Design a protein around this ligand. Sequence first.
Ligand code: HEC
Lengths: 49, 151, 423, 53, 57, 54, 446
Amino acid sequence: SHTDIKVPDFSDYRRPEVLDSTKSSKESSEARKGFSYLVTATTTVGVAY
Amino acid sequence: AALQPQLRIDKAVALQNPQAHVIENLHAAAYRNALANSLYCPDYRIGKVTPVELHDYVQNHFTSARMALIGLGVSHPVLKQVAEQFLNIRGGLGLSGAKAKYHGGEIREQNGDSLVHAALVAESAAIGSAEANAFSVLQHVLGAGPHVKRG
Amino acid sequence: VPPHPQDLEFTRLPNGLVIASLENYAPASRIGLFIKAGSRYENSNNLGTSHLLRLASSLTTKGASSFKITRGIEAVGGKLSVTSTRENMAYTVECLRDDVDILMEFLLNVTTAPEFRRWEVAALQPQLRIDKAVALQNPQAHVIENLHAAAYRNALANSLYCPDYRIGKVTPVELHDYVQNHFTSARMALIGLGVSHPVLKQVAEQFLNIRGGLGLSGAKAKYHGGEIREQNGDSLVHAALVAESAAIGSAEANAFSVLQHVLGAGPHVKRGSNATSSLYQAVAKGVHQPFDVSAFNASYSDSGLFGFYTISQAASAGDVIKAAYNQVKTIAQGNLSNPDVQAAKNKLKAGYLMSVESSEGFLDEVGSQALAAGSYTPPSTVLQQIDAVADADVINAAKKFVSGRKSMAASGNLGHTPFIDEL
Amino acid sequence: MLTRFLGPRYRQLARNWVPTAGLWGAVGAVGLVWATDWRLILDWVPYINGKFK
Amino acid sequence: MLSVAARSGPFAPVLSATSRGVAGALRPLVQAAVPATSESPVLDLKRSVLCRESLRG
Amino acid sequence: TNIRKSHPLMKIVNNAFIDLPAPSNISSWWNFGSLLGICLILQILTGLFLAMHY
Amino acid sequence: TATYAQALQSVPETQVSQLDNGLRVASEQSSQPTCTVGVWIDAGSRYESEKNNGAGYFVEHLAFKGTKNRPGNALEKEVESMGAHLNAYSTREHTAYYIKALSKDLPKAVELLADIVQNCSLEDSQIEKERDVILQELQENDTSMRDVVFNYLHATAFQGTPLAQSVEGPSENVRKLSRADLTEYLSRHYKAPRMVLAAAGGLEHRQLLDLAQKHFSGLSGTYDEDAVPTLSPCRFTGSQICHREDGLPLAHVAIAVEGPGWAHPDNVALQVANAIIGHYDCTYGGGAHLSSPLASIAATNKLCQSFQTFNICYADTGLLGAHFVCDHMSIDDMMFVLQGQWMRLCTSATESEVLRGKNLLRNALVSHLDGTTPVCEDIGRSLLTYGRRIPLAEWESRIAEVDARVVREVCSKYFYDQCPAVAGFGPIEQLPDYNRIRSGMFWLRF
Ligand code: HEC
């Protein structure tokens, strides 16, 4: 009965680099963390000024 | 729900007399049946007795033919009145003898406990019969409790 | 071409100690010190002492601290295990070949130099309550405790788990006492796999010359009988029915072991009707709901218990028991074919062989053989033993169970569970 | 009280943490240099020339 | 054939330094979990299920 | 175990500004409480630097 | 004497020969009186569709209940009567049927496996009986918090991929699966180039190959001429599943990063790092003195009833991490202490603890490979994953190569600043928020 629990489809929210179920996420983990960490690095740089 | 834990305290307070468990066990071993049941609730049942079980117990045991209304310092008309008005319930079991099948055997409880408690017993006689009165006399030939303080 | 297999070396020393080794050229090594020190040697004044003892294996020794035993064994990735039964304690030690020395030393300290420090024992007492709680969550553990307490008035009545009233009451002195008078040369066996005979003989000669305790393997099981009943609520009913049988090693026991396979042990096929299991087929005939039934066979130094064990719904309990019981009765009455026994022989023979195929099961067998017999009996002759059991002996084993003063333990809703009386 | 901290594990523990401890010093240096405007250090920097005479 | 594991029946407890505690021999079970509705006492202040020094390459 | 939970100074901070169980749905209208705290501190630092020359 | 090194060379080479079918037939010989024989199949749940999710699991229930040559009982009766044991299992990637029997009984053992694997009498009356059996087993599994959290972890980590599916399938697929559905998967998957006949014990590889041609040859004629299926990669998702149930007394939490898969050489270093952290359970006697810092902090502070590390491998992917069970108030501390150890290992792994990890692993590997059943399983699985049997000396070689640097390089590769898959069940109010869990995947000091 717990075997019916599938995770709801997330396609609506998924970053485009990880929309393909047949594609490894590792390929795009580097680039994806890059963006969000660049935003942060740029933010701190701005705050620092 | 809130009263369930009182079973564990109630049982703990009685069971601190070594005699209570001895007489529980004595009965569980004597009878395969109804008198085998203890006056205290088995641990596995605490918090498991349902509101329905008690409703059920009352509806089928607290009935007219299983009941007596005794009054001291009251009048007979008043007792008879409340009996006629409030105690006309019937719709449960009938038999005083759902029936004790005496069986026998022993129960042994290793304890550590300062000194040893042991009860040895055989089937005797149902209350009311002539035989029971002989047993009651036997009990005084052999010895009940003391009569003199420190004797 | 594999390597031509070596032969087991065996030696009884004059002092009564036994050494057995086998160089199996395995990448790992296993050493077991087996001791006649199981639960049966406890008395009514020191119950559970051999439980806490079993739990005490990494407390502080002369020559190795608690912390060393742990970190030392963990550093080399070995194990220190202790397995109690009603008759034996067995201290086992595993590691890679190159590391036998450090683990041996640890072994010897745990078994011969335990210090049992006041505060260390104090801190370990609560493990008895967890250890007991974790076992007792199998309904089978309490059933077999109770089965024994009812069967025997005596030594095998004692449980492998410590009675509740004893938890936090076992003294540092009680364990010192238990070791000094049970962990002695004449009550001991040092078994080694992936080790050499000279080395075992050396450590035996050097470190295991202890004697100053009890003598008898038979302080003596007085079989008595009767039943214990435990009202439970518990989903389904557990019941074991048993009579006194035969002491391990005797010819009679082998007949009982065959009887057990005629009637039915555990399953052989994953999810099956257990077609050859005559007990299972017998109950199934008139019980059309979830149940289990197996022949139960326990063999000891001076007594034995044979019968059957049942798992069933509360209301089916008495039907399941009566059906199982009558099935035994028919074998006592003479209703047993030659191929029926032949299959039981094959089931037993194969099962035994499989039981010793790994080094864990091998070492345990050589250990228990060393204590019960003072011998190593090769598989080749164990199979010959089994073969010598005739159909008439298996019948005679069933006849002994049927006509013998029963013992019974059971737990669940006992409302529809019979009473020996009514069997 | 310090003899307990000397042995092969601590030799490995120091080496494991030194690229990091060095890079935090570079952070602190650049950080101090940038914040106080240490024209002593900053004059020799190929773009930061706010002292443009 | 002398071992209370090889005569699959009576109880044996096992304790260890690195490994989980074991119990018992035989005794029904395994042919009691095929006739279903046997959920078993699961995790109510309890040890590790299965035991793991069976790790691979 | 956790240094951030059991230290008699960091514990008090943790239970007020870090691990505090807060509602999932509080509006931008709940921001003014902290913004008051910012305002109060801002007035102190400008206030003092003003009090130095006044 | 005999050095640990020499012992590894003494273990005989696993001999491999191939049938014209493509059935790889392999054995490890010994002087043992018994043996284990089996068929390992390259099939599981990862091959299933969503619309036939319990299919492999269903065949597993039908495989022992009758053939064309042995209707109903007959199989059991034969296996039972020679004293043999017959078992089966199915993971998401592999299905196996094996017989433990006497070495002399190997001719019938192989014969029966051939009949089971090729001539499954999927009688409609029996498939209906199995429907109830499997459905009842679904309700049974629900009560095992550990079986759930791992299915849940699979469901969330492999979101939308075939790997997200359980082995047993959902209830509706058990209720509606037909004989056609079953025969189709059977014919598409139980094909000879995806089957390994494995044996171990008192054997002769000559005698086994003879039997393999005698009983399995019958899959020739024509093969693979219309359709061939090869596995597609499965996307890992750093996600969370939280099943909040405040009526179960202990919390189960399983947390994992994406692992590399069966083939990858760096599974060894992972296993070593896992060995260091290890596993704990309330019945361990060591307590305070345990080497693994997590185990000792768990024991001292009773932070936990049990924890275990794992490196679950699938082709080109996996789950790397730990699972624990604990009281409601201890989830936070368990996570902190666990993630702190991953990071300690990622950044500052020391040489001696890496020896202990290597040592635990050599001991585990050698202890596991004890007896006909574990070794036969190892031959079958290895051939299906690695394409060969990796001999013990090679494992030792690859273990000895791992040092402190290897551990911290490899642990960082997989753990450092990576998104966990997190599955929680039971009294989980105190289970950290995903952001917080994800923040424990790095250190501000490093
Ligand atoms: C360090 C002492 C100090 C603190 C703290 C302080 N101030 Fe002041 N404030 C001053 C001084 C001095 C002046 C006069 C100089 C000036 O007008 O700028 C002043 C000026 C003012 C004025 C007049 C503004 C103008 O320039 O027209 C207001 C209004 C005021 N403060 C309100 C506040 C409030 C509100 C707070 C926070 C509760 C506060 N101040 C905090 C010292 C303080």
